Design a protein around this motif. Structure first.
Motif, PDB file in Angstrom:
ATOM      1  N   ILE A 195       0.796  -1.212   0.061  1.00 45.73           N
ATOM      2  CA  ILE A 195       0.036   0.023   0.139  1.00 45.73           C
ATOM      3  C   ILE A 195       0.869   1.423  -0.089  1.00 45.73           C
ATOM      4  O   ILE A 195       1.781   0.963   0.849  1.00 45.73           O
ATOM      5  CB  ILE A 195      -1.057   0.056   1.380  1.00 45.73           C
ATOM      6  CG1 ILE A 195      -1.795  -1.464   1.321  1.00 45.73           C
ATOM      7  CG2 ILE A 195      -1.940   1.275   1.320  1.00 45.73           C
ATOM      8  CD1 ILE A 195      -2.858  -1.563   0.461  1.00 45.73           C
TER       9      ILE A 195
ATOM     10  N   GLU B 226      -4.370   2.359   3.977  1.00 52.49           N
ATOM     11  CA  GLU B 226      -5.278   2.638   2.889  1.00 52.49           C
ATOM     12  C   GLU B 226      -4.299   3.393   2.013  1.00 52.49           C
ATOM     13  O   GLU B 226      -3.931   4.325   2.258  1.00 52.49           O
ATOM     14  CB  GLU B 226      -6.403   3.200   3.293  1.00 52.49           C
ATOM     15  CG  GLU B 226      -7.698   3.196   2.257  1.00 52.49           C
ATOM     16  CD  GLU B 226      -8.928   3.404   2.958  1.00 52.49           C
ATOM     17  OE1 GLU B 226      -9.049   4.444   3.745  1.00 52.49           O
ATOM     18  OE2 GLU B 226      -9.971   2.646   2.532  1.00 52.49           O
TER      19      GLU B 226
ATOM     20  N   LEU C 109      -2.575   0.661  -4.455  1.00 45.31           N
ATOM     21  CA  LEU C 109      -2.238  -0.576  -4.332  1.00 45.31           C
ATOM     22  C   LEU C 109      -1.099  -0.909  -5.373  1.00 45.31           C
ATOM     23  O   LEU C 109      -1.264  -0.444  -6.487  1.00 45.31           O
ATOM     24  CB  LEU C 109      -3.339  -1.808  -4.696  1.00 45.31           C
ATOM     25  CG  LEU C 109      -2.859  -3.314  -4.850  1.00 45.31           C
ATOM     26  CD1 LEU C 109      -2.395  -3.820  -3.539  1.00 45.31           C
ATOM     27  CD2 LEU C 109      -4.062  -3.825  -5.430  1.00 45.31           C
TER      28      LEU C 109
ATOM     29  N   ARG D  71      -7.196  -1.144   0.688  1.00 46.47           N
ATOM     30  CA  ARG D  71      -7.002  -0.972   2.285  1.00 46.47           C
ATOM     31  C   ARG D  71      -6.588  -2.629   2.555  1.00 46.47           C
ATOM     32  O   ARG D  71      -7.153  -3.678   2.224  1.00 46.47           O
ATOM     33  CB  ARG D  71      -8.196  -0.749   2.804  1.00 46.47           C
ATOM     34  CG  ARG D  71      -8.266  -0.555   4.414  1.00 46.47           C
ATOM     35  CD  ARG D  71      -9.403  -0.110   5.015  1.00 46.47           C
ATOM     36  NE  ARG D  71     -10.562  -1.471   5.118  1.00 46.47           N
ATOM     37  CZ  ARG D  71     -10.350  -2.187   5.895  1.00 46.47           C
ATOM     38  NH1 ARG D  71      -9.773  -2.357   6.703  1.00 46.47           N
ATOM     39  NH2 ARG D  71     -11.601  -3.211   5.857  1.00 46.47           N
ATOM     40  N   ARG D  72      -5.331  -2.592   3.346  1.00 40.45           N
ATOM     41  CA  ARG D  72      -5.024  -3.780   4.153  1.00 40.45           C
ATOM     42  C   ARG D  72      -5.285  -3.719   5.454  1.00 40.45           C
ATOM     43  O   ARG D  72      -5.132  -2.721   6.059  1.00 40.45           O
ATOM     44  CB  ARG D  72      -3.509  -3.913   3.828  1.00 40.45           C
ATOM     45  CG  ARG D  72      -3.095  -5.215   4.325  1.00 40.45           C
ATOM     46  CD  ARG D  72      -1.577  -5.541   4.085  1.00 40.45           C
ATOM     47  NE  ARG D  72      -0.695  -4.545   4.848  1.00 40.45           N
ATOM     48  CZ  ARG D  72       0.080  -3.512   4.334  1.00 40.45           C
ATOM     49  NH1 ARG D  72       0.371  -3.793   2.838  1.00 40.45           N
ATOM     50  NH2 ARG D  72       0.536  -2.735   5.114  1.00 40.45           N
TER      51      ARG D  72
ATOM     52  N   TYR E 222      -6.369  -7.849   2.081  1.00 43.79           N
ATOM     53  CA  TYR E 222      -6.740  -6.762   1.320  1.00 43.79           C
ATOM     54  C   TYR E 222      -8.033  -6.424   0.739  1.00 43.79           C
ATOM     55  O   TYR E 222      -8.725  -7.579   0.316  1.00 43.79           O
ATOM     56  CB  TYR E 222      -5.884  -6.900   0.074  1.00 43.79           C
ATOM     57  CG  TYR E 222      -4.431  -6.448   0.258  1.00 43.79           C
ATOM     58  CD1 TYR E 222      -3.353  -7.746   0.887  1.00 43.79           C
ATOM     59  CD2 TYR E 222      -3.689  -5.288  -0.035  1.00 43.79           C
ATOM     60  CE1 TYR E 222      -2.175  -7.454   0.839  1.00 43.79           C
ATOM     61  CE2 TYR E 222      -2.156  -5.130   0.438  1.00 43.79           C
ATOM     62  CZ  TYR E 222      -1.419  -6.164   0.780  1.00 43.79           C
ATOM     63  OH  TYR E 222      -0.412  -5.999   1.104  1.00 43.79           O
TER      64      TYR E 222
END
Ligand SMILES: CC(C)(COP(=O)(O)OP(=O)(O)OC[C@H]1O[C@@H](n2cnc3c(N)ncnc32)[C@H](O)[C@@H]1OP(=O)(O)O)[C@@H](O)C(=O)NCCC(=O)NCCS
Ligand SMILES: Nc1ncnc2c1ncn2[C@@H]1O[C@H](COP(=O)(O)O)[C@@H](O)[C@H]1O
Ligand SMILES: [Cl-]
Ligand SMILES: [Cl-]
Ligand SMILES: [K+]
Length: 661
Positions: A459, A473, A476, A514-515, A521
């Motif tokens: 991210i 967030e 990607l 977002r991770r 993910y």
């Protein structure tokens, strides 16, 4: 967390990986730390090589950093192989009687079980037609404009067998869009079919091809056309157009039995796939041979936990990367038994896919959130008449899946005895990048979960553009190469470096994500002006260009808006020249213009006339944020209007949108 769904016990016991997350994480950690050895061992175990790469410890070389030199990726360099041989020949004679495709037409009385033996014959006949009647040579470009029939797979494999480069054009594209692709790829040959049918709608293919070839000829190209008999008395130009049946008749008898294999270097080009970007016209993503072959097949096997006793059904078209990797190439390389369906989920009625599932004992079904949502709307009675007891894996591709559709897929469609593989990836990655694996991956509805083996996502902070650790967030990106990555954009490496390597060290996906605290993910969608409409990637500037070709149109602006079936719909704001008589007919003619220029996939969902004009700055730039917010009914979030030359327009844009919506 409470939203976690555990993998089914039965899938855990069957898994290639194992019955719990630790099993996956063991392999994953090795696939990152011993990346070359991991891919070398997979490559040696699962594929035939005429010649192997020289050093297991160095099967990749790359540069992701523009300051060091040009961006490049190479895999398995020095190895020699062939994709057709791995998909077809090596499975004989042991599996000659195994079904490759349970084919069903749009009309349910049209069915054929096509074995791997029969595919060999079909591919050898076509390969010889291409070699000895069309003089197709290694590296020549061949266009495919075909429906989802056995001959489509046959043509892809025949071209692979002789080292030709295919470019597949989705049957939904118009004549002008087909023509643009043929010209840009410089195809020597077009392979199409007389026609198809989707539900009650005729799908002209050759008739469309006729206009496209005429356009290419007006531009000085000479393109031959070979037509399969799917349904006819199509217009056939003498000397340009041949029926496949007439070509087959010119083959000597032993050419129905043998065609030599072109042995390909690892980085020889396999196919070009035109894909929409945020700016300009669609460009062709280039995939080479060995790395793509390895990546597409390995993701197929693990993401879906394919075993030989599984029967597999992907509902995606060959005109998209999903049908390349997960209808033809991946499945056949692992000798899968697949379902190949020409038609639509609602013809004869909305039970059709479930009729196919029960008839052929489908155990793995790979489809799209937009299709699931339409089936949801249709009603559960259409699902519950079908025996779904054989399903054990369900996959989702092409767009984010909402929690309601996920649950419905698993607990209504799959009767609660299925794992769900929500697979995130894109044309440019060749294969799955973040996905659950059945039996070993706890699932969070709406999350793609964990990276595939060999993949290292990150991210990136949208502001600082460095990696963010922990729950985060941002943009990607992928920090290291994987074998399936596209090697360039056809004829534009500069744009490739611009688009994907703007941040030195990383492949920029173009998606937000977002991770979470588990490392799962959640993909939030495109961060550029690219729409995903019913799962189909399409650029807003292409649609605007098409809209503006109408003579009554002065200017248009196209935005996505949330759509409860399609995920994202196409919203057009446009202005007409002074005096125009605005009617539903005129609006319908502007839609038809888009459909002529691009195709029905680009059909505008809403047309709003800016009676006062588009919101533009004093420099002439359209303020797209206002239009995105208005089209989504987010009236309070319009944002700044102080740089508008024409702030008077805002009130009308809202008023009209309220009138329509
Ligand atoms: O449901 P679905 O038909 O599977 O997907 P869609 O209904 O959104 O297809 C949108 C249009 O693309 C067309 N389409 C979709 N897939 C297609 C294909 N493989 N070939 C040709 N046209 C196709 C549909 O016919 C539809 O055309 P229409 O507006 O004239 O009715
Ligand atoms: N599983 C998924 N979840 C969310 N978005 C997806 C998923 N799969 C595909 N996409 C979207 O589709 C794009 C790729 O489209 P395409 O290159 O046509 O396959 C991605 O960049 C995403 O925006
Ligand atoms: Cl050979
Ligand atoms: Cl197996
Ligand atoms: K997509």
């Amino acid at each position: 967390d409470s939203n976690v769904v555990e993998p089914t016990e039965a899938n855990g016991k069957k898994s290639h990986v194992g019955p719990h997350l630790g099993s996956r994480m063991r392999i994953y950690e090795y696939s990152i730390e011993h990346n070359d050895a991991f891919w070398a061992e997979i490559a040696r175990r699962d594929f035939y090589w005429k010649t192997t790469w020289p050093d297991d410890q160095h099967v990749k070389s790359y540069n992701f950093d523009k300051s060091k030199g040009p961006i490049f990726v190479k895999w398995f360099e020095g190895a020699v192989t062939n994709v057709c041989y791995n998909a077809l020949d090596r499975h004989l004679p042991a599996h000659k009687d195994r079904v490759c495709f349970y084919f069903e037409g749009n009309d349910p009385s049209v069915t054929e079980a096509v074995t791997y033996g029969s595919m060999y014959t079909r591919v050898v006949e076509l390969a010889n037609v291409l070699k000895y009647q069309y003089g197709i040579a290694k590296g020549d470009r061949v266009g495919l404009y075909l429906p989802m029939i056995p001959f489509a797979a046959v043509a892809m494999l025949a071209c692979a067998r002789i080292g030709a480069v295919i470019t597949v054009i989705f049957g939904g594209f118009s004549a002008q869009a087909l023509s643009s692709r043929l010209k840009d790829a410089q195809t020597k040959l077009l392979i199409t079919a007389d026609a198809s049918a989707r539900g009650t709608k005729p799908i002209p293919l050759k008739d469309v091809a006729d206009e496209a070839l005429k356009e290419c000829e007006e531009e000085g190209m000479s393109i031959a056309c070979l037509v399969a008999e799917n349904m006819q008395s199509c217009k056939m130009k003498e000397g340009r157009d041949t029926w496949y049946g007439d070509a087959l008749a010119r083959l000597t008898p032993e050419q129905h039995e043998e065609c030599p294999v072109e042995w390909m270097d690892a980085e020889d080009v396999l196919f070009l796939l035109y894909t929409s970007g945020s700016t300009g016209k669609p460009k062709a993503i280039v995939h080479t041979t060995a790395g793509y072959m390895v990546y597409a097949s390995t993701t197929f096997m693990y993401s879906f936990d394919y075993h030989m006793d599984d029967v597999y059904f992907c509902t995606a078209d060959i005109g998209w990367i999903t049908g390349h990797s997960y209808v033809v190439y991946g499945p056949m390389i692992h000798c899968a038994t697949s379902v190949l369906f020409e038609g639509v989920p609602n013809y004869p009625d909305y039970s059709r896919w479930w009729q196919l599932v029960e008839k052929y004992k489908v155990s793995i079904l790979y489809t799209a959130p937009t299709a699931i949502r339409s089936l949801m709307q249709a009603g559960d009675d259409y699902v519950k008449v079908g025996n779904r007891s054989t399903l054990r894996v369900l996959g989702s591709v092409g767009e984010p899946i909402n929690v309601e559709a996920w649950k419905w897929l698993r607990d209504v469609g799959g009767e609660g005895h299925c794992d769900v593989s929500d697979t995130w990836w894109q044309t440019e990655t060749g294969g799955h990048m973040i996905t659950p694996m059945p039996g070993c991956t706890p699932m969070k509805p709406g999350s793609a979960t964990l990276p595939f083996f060999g993949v290292q996502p990150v991210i990136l902070d949208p502001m600082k553009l460095h990696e963010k650790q922990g729950p985060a967030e941002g943009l990607l990106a992928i920090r290291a190469p994987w074998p399936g990555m596209a090697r360039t954009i056809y004829g534009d490496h500069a744009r490739f470096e611009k688009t994907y390597f703007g941040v030195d060290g990383y492949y920029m996906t173009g998606d937000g994500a977002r991770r979470d605290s588990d490392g799962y993910y959640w993909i939030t969608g495109r961060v550029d002006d690219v729409l995903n409409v019913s799962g189909h990637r399409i650029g807003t500037s292409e649609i605007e260009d098409a809209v503006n070709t109408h003579p009554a149109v002065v200017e248009s602006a196209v935005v996505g808006f949330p759509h409860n079936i399609k995920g994202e719909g196409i919203y057009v704001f446009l202005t007409f020249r002074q005096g125009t008589e605005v009617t539903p007919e005129l609006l319908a003619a502007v839609k038809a213009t888009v459909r002529k220029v691009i195709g029905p996939l680009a059909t505008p969902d809403v047309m709003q006339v800016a009676r006062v004009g588009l919101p533009k700055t004093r420099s002439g730039k359209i303020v797209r944020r206002i239009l995105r917010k208005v089209s989504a009914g987010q009236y309070t979030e319009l944002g700044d209007t102080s740089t508008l030359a024409n702030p008077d327009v805002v009130e009308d844009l809202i008023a009209e949108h309220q009138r329509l919506c």
